[PDB]
Amino acid sequence: KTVVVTTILESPYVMMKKNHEMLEGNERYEGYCVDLAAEIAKHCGFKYKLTIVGDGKYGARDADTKIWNGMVGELVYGKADIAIAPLTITLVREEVIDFSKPFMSLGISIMIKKVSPIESAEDLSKQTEIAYGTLDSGSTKEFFRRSKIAVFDKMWTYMRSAEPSVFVRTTAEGVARVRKSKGKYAYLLESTMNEYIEQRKPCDTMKVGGNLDSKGYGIATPKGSSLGTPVNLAVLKLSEQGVLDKLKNKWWYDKGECGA
Amino acid sequence: KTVVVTTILESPYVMMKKNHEMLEGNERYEGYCVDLAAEIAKHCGFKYKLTIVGDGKYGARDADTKIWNGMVGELVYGKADIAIAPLTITLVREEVIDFSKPFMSLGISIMIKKPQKSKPLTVERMVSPIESAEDLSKQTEIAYGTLDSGSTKEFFRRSKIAVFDKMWTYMRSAEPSVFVRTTAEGVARVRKSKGKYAYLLESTMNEYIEQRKPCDTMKVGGNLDSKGYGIATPKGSSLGTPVNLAVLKLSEQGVLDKLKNKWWYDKGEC
Amino acid sequence: KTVVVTTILESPYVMMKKNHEMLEGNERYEGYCVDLAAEIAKHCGFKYKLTIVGDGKYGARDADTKIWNGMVGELVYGKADIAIAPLTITLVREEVIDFSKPFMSLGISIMIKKPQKSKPLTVERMVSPIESAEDLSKQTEIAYGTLDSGSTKEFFRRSKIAVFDKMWTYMRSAEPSVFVRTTAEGVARVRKSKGKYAYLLESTMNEYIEQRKPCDTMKVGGNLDSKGYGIATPKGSSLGTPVNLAVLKLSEQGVLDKLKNKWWYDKGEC
Amino acid sequence: KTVVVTTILESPYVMMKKNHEMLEGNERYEGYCVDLAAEIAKHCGFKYKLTIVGDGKYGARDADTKIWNGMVGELVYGKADIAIAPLTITLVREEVIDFSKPFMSLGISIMIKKVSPIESAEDLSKQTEIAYGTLDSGSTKEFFRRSKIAVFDKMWTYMRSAEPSVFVRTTAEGVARVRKSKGKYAYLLESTMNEYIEQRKPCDTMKVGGNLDSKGYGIATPKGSSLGTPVNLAVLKLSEQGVLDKLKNKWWYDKGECGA
């Protein structure tokens, strides 16, 4: 029984190689998540087929319709069996899907155009000269929406009532916007993606300040599935064997086409 | 029914209060773990009684007897209901108990005695003889050890990495023994060995010991791996999911970060 | 019963919102005074309707008619129940209305156009032609004026200090008139007079105007006196003591401090 | 009828006369508050007799007995007709006595021994190596006790549970303690007293940071008295005529027995 593996096109997690037109099956995808899925399948011992989520959404709930979209939606509604992808572990997701142990620590970080005047998030909220937003229907926007801290509350209140739409549909759109804004825009995204972008050409983006919080990516399965314990054990074994460290070093720092 | 919580006597997780010779109950202990347990009880309502393991060990499987000891061992046999303590999530422990999501990140680091400032135009520089684990294993004048019945010892024993295997081979055949009974004993050995002893402990304890007086120890290199601390629940128990969601809520509301900052960096003696 | 609150259109106390054409009710206005009114209504439960005086004056006595005008005047005759606005507590006003305890300190300051950074090694220095009220009165090249029907004009009219008396004598016999009908008009005169006009206004508005773009104005010297802003109330009204208690309570909680920091410092630039 | 005036020996508000052994009446007292009382009597037109409060406390409520001590007690219980003294206007006091308009602005300040490693009160709260307390039965301890701010809550919790007693019976004891502590103790007191102390010899104490909050001194009268409105009008007249500024300049900066 082939296991359906939903995932999203995120770099360096999943990429469509370079000559994908002449390739078929899972051989046309490469990245950290592809390697993670291969190791998970090797440990558990199942045949899998990588599938790309129909909409480029990680997963959230719509305007009071209680419907999950993106990867979480495909998991809940039975459209997929497992999600090896950068899915942040959150409160709202955990109640509906089974998350494994985190395979990568991360956090929310500020990235800007290349002594920065903002540095910390407090100064970023205080100064209204520079605009800042998040990814639409992701996890950072939900973190800001439900945040009770005064600084994050001010951040979310400004971001929601902003003209034009300060949010972006895809993280690539966000990095393009912050590159083209001539330093007038700040992008809020995961620390791992921030470091990957800052370690790539043309190296015009830099990460400033610290991490707003601490989160992690987990392998998600439908609630009440038989694969949750095996994939949890496989993630633990991979972490203890250094496989996750090796994969992150390969896909984040082995190439390093940046000047640092 | 009041459940029993087990914890280890580790700072700044659970430390006896100053006036603890006359106090009774959970008010005797202060630290990160006590008010973490308070927050857990506040989220999901239950009555808890803090307890300390008699052996004072974190937990490991004994060879040729397959008997778990320490916090994990006493949690398996049913004399505890929940382990809110700096217990490291491992593969061996996950097959006998249930671990929640990590509430604090950590890693294996190296602790050494802080060298004196180098004299040479008038700038002072810090020169250290060990800067990573590769050169720590490649030398012989400095002994290094871990904590017995801990996660680090099991990690080094079961590691297939070349440098980690070399360090494990060194500490296995070491005379006198480089293993310590308690973290505080390891720090005492580090401060007493005049700079010839390195301690392989967790990064959180290393940073906490660095921040407090007499601050004669330093952390060299990065972490050897990435791990986490989880709240341990007996396998097949009713306190697993509520505790996991409680940890998730405390992470999302910022309680964990504020607790860490007020228990590690607020009391920055040095 | 819904009581009517009067206020003046003075930044940052009350400013029309950007989308104020379609919005109705108290949501039209934003600023320090609307937040103060909300807090006052939260202290003691009552419904309020924000209003703006038609004449747009703070309040003064007319010549030879002994008739009050402005916010104070319309509060005396009973067309308003409470004045939550930057109304300065004075002796003449206290004899006809009731003032609560000051909710913000202030003083009379001098506003001039900011000069250019002077150069002579390669350091830029700030050189100003006026640095006190004494040298402002002694000099004659730069004209100075105040706000019509304001507290500062009454202070200068009834001042027995030699310097203040000289300045008032200059203002009375001034051609063309140095008095402005609105604070914004005075700042516009300062900006467009290219350094030949000095505005004598309240310290809070002076700092607020200095803190925003294009920030071509500067405050010279210190405050000529010390005063405060109070919430006015008609004599013998039931709203006096509850509002005074509310102001004291908001001072104790530090709500006034955070309102000031949010409406004066956070929104500033340059 | 001679109006009884209660006051406390505080410098430079009320000071004992140099040759007071040979003097009697109100001519044996001098200071800012003595001049204030003289101006109030001149404006209202009443004869007064300055009386020193029995216990050197400004006023507070005791441990669950609802009894006012100090000057507020003398006012409430009919033992005094008016209080021209540095009495801080507070919500708890206003409910039992009638304050006039503030005749002097002030705030909580941090005063230490003369690199300045303390800065604002945030660092003072985050630091456990330096001791700091307040005046007992005053208004600063009440402000710290009822404060709902996290920094001030931490300050109060540390101060109450401190061994030995971090509080001082009189402000002079506090300044002596901070002088003799070799920089290990900090004293929290009113900004006016802090400035007066640092401006007088030996000038070994210096102020750091800004004022914690803003308060003021008002002339207190018994509730439901006929003197409240006349003294309020007199205070307003004195403020308008510059008499209060003149007296502050006379008693704070006119001597200036310091090098600054």
Ligand SMILES: NS(=O)(=O)c1cc2c(cc1Cl)N[C@H]([C@H]1C[C@H]3C=C[C@@H]1C3)NS2(=O)=O
């Ligand atoms: N260095 S890293 O970001 O690639 C990374 C991060 C993490 C890893 C492993 C790696 Cl390699 N494993 C941990 C897991 C292992 C066991 C202990 C904590 C969880 C359960 N999660 S983690 O702390 O999020």
Ligand SMILES: NS(=O)(=O)c1cc2c(cc1Cl)N[C@H]([C@H]1C[C@H]3C=C[C@@H]1C3)NS2(=O)=O
């Ligand atoms: N900054 S820290 O080490 O005290 C720390 C570390 C971690 C926190 C929260 C804090 Cl405050 N929460 C995460 C949890 C939240 C969700 C995502 C990963 C786990 C499940 N684990 S963590 O990445 O191990």
Ligand SMILES: NS(=O)(=O)c1cc2c(cc1Cl)N[C@H]([C@H]1C[C@H]3C=C[C@@H]1C3)NS2(=O)=O
């Ligand atoms: N810092 S400020 O100008 O916003 C400011 C100014 C003042 C505040 C509070 C603040 Cl936050 N409260 C005082 C009041 C409190 C009690 C003592 C004096 C009045 C009654 N008035 S004040 O001295 O005019």
Ligand SMILES: NS(=O)(=O)c1cc2c(cc1Cl)N[C@H]([C@H]1C[C@H]3C=C[C@@H]1C3)NS2(=O)=O
């Ligand atoms: N410069 S000072 O501290 O001596 C000082 C302080 C103050 C003065 C007068 C002086 Cl001289 N008057 C004001 C009062 C006057 C009118 C306006 C506010 C109150 C009512 N209170 S105050 O703002 O506390």
Ligand SMILES: N[C@@H](CCC(=O)O)C(=O)O
């Ligand atoms: N990776 C996040 C979204 C990225 C972001 O919000 O910055 C998720 O799983 O939803």
Ligand SMILES: N[C@@H](CCC(=O)O)C(=O)O
């Ligand atoms: N925290 C570790 C013990 C400390 C160590 O091994 O350094 C554990 O849970 O096993």
Ligand SMILES: N[C@@H](CCC(=O)O)C(=O)O
């Ligand atoms: N705030 C002053 C008016 C402003 C001014 O006179 O500068 C008043 O209440 O009268």
Ligand SMILES: N[C@@H](CCC(=O)O)C(=O)O
């Ligand atoms: N002046 C204050 C007391 C001074 C202090 O506590 O520092 C009062 O009236 O209570």
